[PDB]
Amino acid sequence: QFRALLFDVQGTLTDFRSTLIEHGLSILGDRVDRELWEELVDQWRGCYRDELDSLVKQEKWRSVRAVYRDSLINLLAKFSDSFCATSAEVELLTDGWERLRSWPDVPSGLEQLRSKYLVAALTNADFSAIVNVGRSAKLQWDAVLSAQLFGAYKPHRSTYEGAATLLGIAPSEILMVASHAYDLEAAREVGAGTAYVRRPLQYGPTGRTEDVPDGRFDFLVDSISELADQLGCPRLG
Amino acid sequence: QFRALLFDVQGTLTDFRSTLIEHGLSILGDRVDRELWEELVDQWRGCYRDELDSLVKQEKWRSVRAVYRDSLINLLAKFSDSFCATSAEVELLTDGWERLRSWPDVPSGLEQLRSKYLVAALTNADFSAIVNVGRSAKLQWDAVLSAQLFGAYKPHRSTYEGAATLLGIAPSEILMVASHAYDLEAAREVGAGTAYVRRPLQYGPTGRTEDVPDGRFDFLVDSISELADQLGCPRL
C-alpha cells in the first residue's frame, strides 16, 4: 500500500535534546551549568513550538533557523543574569539544531526500509537544516522535503500533500513516521498511514513522553528497524 | 570554496540513452528494431529538448513526465506504421526516463565527493523522476532538487539560486556539475563553479560532442571520481 515513508526527523530520528545540550555546553563551556543549559534547551524547543504553532495558525512560513535564533535571543534575554552569548555564539548555538545526532536504530532502519520504500524527510526545519542534519545524523534519504518547499509547516495539509505531489504518489501511499502524535494525526487527515516511533529518551532521562496506545496509529514501534520489519522489509545482513 | 556539488543527472550521471533503448526494447519486444527504437529514443530526447526549450522561452513549467509522455505519443504517431504502443506501454515507456542507469563511475564518484561536499541533484526532471532515478542509478544525494520545486527549468537563474538558497549556501559555494555546457554556463551566470563531465557516449557513438575546451569551465573531467580527485577528496 505504501510507496514512501515520510519521516519527521527531529526527535523521531534524532536525539535533538542530547545534541542541543552537548552543543550548547561545548560552545558556552563554564558559562552555563548543564542543569541550566538543559532547561534552556527545553524552553528553546518550547519557544520554537510556540512560534511554529503561531505561524501555522497564521498560515505563514518563515525560516525555522530564524525561529530558533529569535527564540534563543529571547531566551538569552531571560537568562541574561546567568550568562550571555555573542551574536556569533547565537549562530553557533542555533547551528546545534542542524547538528542533530540520530538515534542508534535510525541509519540501519532507514536502509532497511529502502528495499521496499522510498524514504523521505518531511521536516519543518529549513531545507538546509535537514540536509545538514543528514550528515550529523547519518540520514540518507531518497528525498529531503522541508516546510520551506511548501511555504507551510506540518501539521498543515499542504506539507503532506505537497510531499505526496512531489513524490508522485497519493497521500494514501505515504506512511508518515513521527514520534509526535500531532504529525501523524495531520498526515492521517490527508490519508497517509501513520507510524509512531516511541522515543522514551527524546526529552531526556526524566522527560515526559506521549503514552501512545496500540491501535491509535497504523504502527507503533520503538525503532525504525522494527517498523521496517513490520512493513515486511527484508532484514539487513 | 565549494560546500555543495549540484549535479545535472540525465547524461551527466546517467546513461539515459542506453537506459531508454534497453527499456523500450524490453517493453516493445519484437515490435521494434533496436535501430528504429534507438532513432526514436534520440528523437524523443530531441522532442523533449524542443518542448523544454519552448517552455523555458515561454516562462512556463510543466510536468517533465508529461513532456516525455506527450512527445512519445507524438513520436508513436510518426512511427505508427512501424509499431504501436498501448496507453499502458506509453506510461511504461515514459517510465524509462525515471529508470536511468548511472555511468559506472558515478556512485563511487558521488561517494568520494560526500566526504567534503554536499552533493545534490538539480534536474529539470520532475521531483519524483529524480527520486526514482536515485534508485535506478544508485545515486544517493544530500538533497534532490527539481525544476518542479522552482516552477522553472534550468537554465533559469531561479533554479540554481533556488538550489543555493534551499541548501543555505552561496551560489559561489556551489560547484555545478553537468555534461551540458548550457547548464554550467547558466550556473556560472548565478556565480556557481562549473565542472563539465565529458560523456562521449551520452548520445551514443554517433553523438555530437560539445566544444568544451580546458579552461572553459572550472573543471573538465571524464568521471565524477576524477572531479572528486581534483577537488581534493581522498579515495575511499
Numbering used by the authors:
A (entry chain B): 11 to 247
B (entry chain A): 11 to 246
Original authors' sentences:
Microbial epoxide hydrolases, cis-epoxysuccinate hydrolases (CESHs), have been utilized for commercial production of enantiomerically pure L(+)- and D(−)-tartaric acids for decades. All these three CESH[L]s exhibit high sequence identity (>60%) with L-2-haloacid dehalogenases, which are members of the haloacid dehalogenase (HAD)-like superfamily. Studies have shown that both RhCESH[L] and KlCESH[L] adopt a two-step catalytic reaction mechanism by 18O-labeling studies.
